[PDB]
Amino acid sequence: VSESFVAPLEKRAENDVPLGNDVPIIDLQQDHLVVVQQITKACQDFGLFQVINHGLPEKLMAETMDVCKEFFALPAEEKEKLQPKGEPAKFELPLEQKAKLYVEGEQEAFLYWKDTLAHGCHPLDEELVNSWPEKPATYREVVAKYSVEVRKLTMRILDYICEGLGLKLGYFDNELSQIQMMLTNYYPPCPDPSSTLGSGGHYDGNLITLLQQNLPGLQQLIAKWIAVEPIPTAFVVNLGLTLKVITNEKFEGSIHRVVTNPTRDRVSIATLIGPDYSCTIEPAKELLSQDNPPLYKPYSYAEFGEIYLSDKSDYDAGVKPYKIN
Ligand SMILES: CN1[C@H]2C[C@H](OC(=O)[C@H](CO)c3ccccc3)C[C@@H]1[C@@H](O)C2
Ligand SMILES: [Fe+2]
Ligand SMILES: [Sr+2]
Ligand SMILES: [Sr+2]
């Protein structure tokens, strides 16, 4: 592989990462209180769980994976239409909601073995959808339906979380969930998987992420890495750094990475829901007391975003400046 993609020695993945047998798989068609309790335990102990029988149509999940794979099968001349000034966009502010192809890495500067299609999904209007990919022909109609359904499921999970925390229902149904970035991640086969990463270890900076996958490669840090079993009809729920802060660390954030494969490609669909850049983030005042003092001072999501996207010296470098007590 090009030296551009060689990860620092300490960040390279070992070849035999064990299956995470303790990753919670939560059936959302259990009794209401059982679902609340199981989600609450998973958020407190792990910060990563899968949801099944989640009410999002399996046919739509399959049709969305199909059109996402079809997009990444498009020729160069079509993909160039999503490369501003002839190259992929960077994950930096301002993060625009129009569709672009993105490159990502860390500055021992190296690049992730990954192509990402990203666009906003909320609110859905003619202007936003007109800024989505023109090809494949069915991308817009399928992904419009998918984005509405994934948001519906995310808001159900956030209200289960509200009941678990003792927050009012709809606590996150506001500016805290206003941004919905859909990241379609393409991992082509890699000649040297021992030296590269599809995605370096990270928290998602946002509130909550739902991830759809068909093939292995996703791993979680529990200094022990575990493999997250692909269930094609499930969503992986990753709690973000923003929810870790708002819950005053009552909930864990998911630290995860993606490893490369020498033989086959992989497509994942990540729906990243979180605050508008104008938001002020702080521990929920409703949960604070002399026994539970705030561990973070209030901060600008925009200010956090700039640090989160640039400083990868530590997983929580984004929130380090705002730590108190
Ligand atoms: C591996 N990368 C991490 C950083 C970046 O994330 C983003 O771009 C999100 C998109 O909501 C973001 C969150 C919080 C602040 C700024 C950006 C792109 C991807 C994600 O999987 C997480
Ligand atoms: Fe992520
Ligand atoms: Sr180009
Ligand atoms: Sr257009």
Map out the domains of the chain as residue ranges: 3-280
State which residues have CB under 5 angstroms from ligand 3, the bound ion: 83, 86
What is d(CA 142, CA 23) in angstroms, rounded to the nearest whole number?
30
| Residue 206 beta carbon below 6 angstroms from any ligand 1 atom | yes
Ligand 1, atom 1: closest residue by C-alpha: 199
Which residue has 């508008």 as its token pair?
276
Which residue has 């026994």 as its token pair?
291
Of ligand 1's listed atoms, the one at least distance from the Cα of 204 is 22
CB within 8 Å of 93: residues ≥ 6 apart: 277, 302, 305, 306, 309
Q: Quickly count helices (H) and strands (E) in the chain.
A: 7, 17
3-state secondary structure of 269: strand
CB within 8 Å of 67: residues ≥ 6 apart: 136, 138, 139, 142, 143
How is 118-169 classified by DSSP, letter by letter?
EEE-SS--HHHHHTS---STTHHHHHHHHHHHHHHHHHHHHHHHHHHHTPPT
How is 273-316 classified by DSSP, letter by letter?
EE--TTPEE---GGG--SSS--SB--EEHHHHHHHHHH--SSTT
First to last CA, the chain: 46
3-state secondary structure of 84: helix
How is 185-237 classified by DSSP, letter by letter?
EEE---S-TTT--SEEEE--SSSEEEEEESSS-EEEE---EEE----TTSEEE
Q: What is the 3-state secondary structure (H, E, C) of 126-140?
A: HHHHHCCCCCCCCHH
What is d(CA 252, CA 45) in angstroms, rounded to the nearest whole number?
7
Which residue has 């399928």 as its token pair?
142
177, 202, 236: residue to mutate for ligand 1 pocket, most atoms within 8 A of CB: 202
92, 206, 268, 316: residue to mutate for ligand 1 pocket, most atoms within 8 A of CB: 206
Ligand 1, atom 14: closest residue by C-alpha: 205
Which residue has 């973000």 as its token pair?
240
Nearest to residue 277, comparing CAs of 97, 78, 64? Answer: 97
Nearest to residue 158, comparing CAs of 228, 210, 122? Answer: 210
Cα(86) to ligand 3 centroid in Å equals 4
The resolution, in Å, is: 1.6
Amino acid symbol at 148:
V
CA atoms within 13 A on the CB side of 99: 21
Contact 216/305 with Cβ under 8 angstroms? no
C-alpha 53 chain-centroid distance:
21
Exposed/middle/buried for residue 283 (C-beta within 10 Å: 0-12, 13-18, 19+): buried
CA distances from 267 to 65, 126, 195, 274, 275 (A): 8, 27, 20, 23, 26
What is d(CA 81, CA 96) in angstroms, rounded to the nearest whole number?
16
Sign for the pseudo-dihedral over CA of 145, 150, 152, 153: positive
3-state secondary structure of 25: strand
| Residue 305 beta carbon below 6 angstroms from any ligand 1 atom | yes
What is d(CA 277, CA 266) in angstroms, rounded to the nearest whole number?
31
What is d(CA 113, CA 222) in angstroms, rounded to the nearest whole number?
23
| Residue 204 beta carbon below 6 angstroms from any ligand 1 atom | yes
For the domain spanning 3-280, the CATH number is 2.60.120.330
Which residue has 């954030």 as its token pair?
253
CB within 8 Å of 273: residues ≥ 6 apart: 122, 151, 154, 177, 179, 180, 206, 207, 208, 209, 210
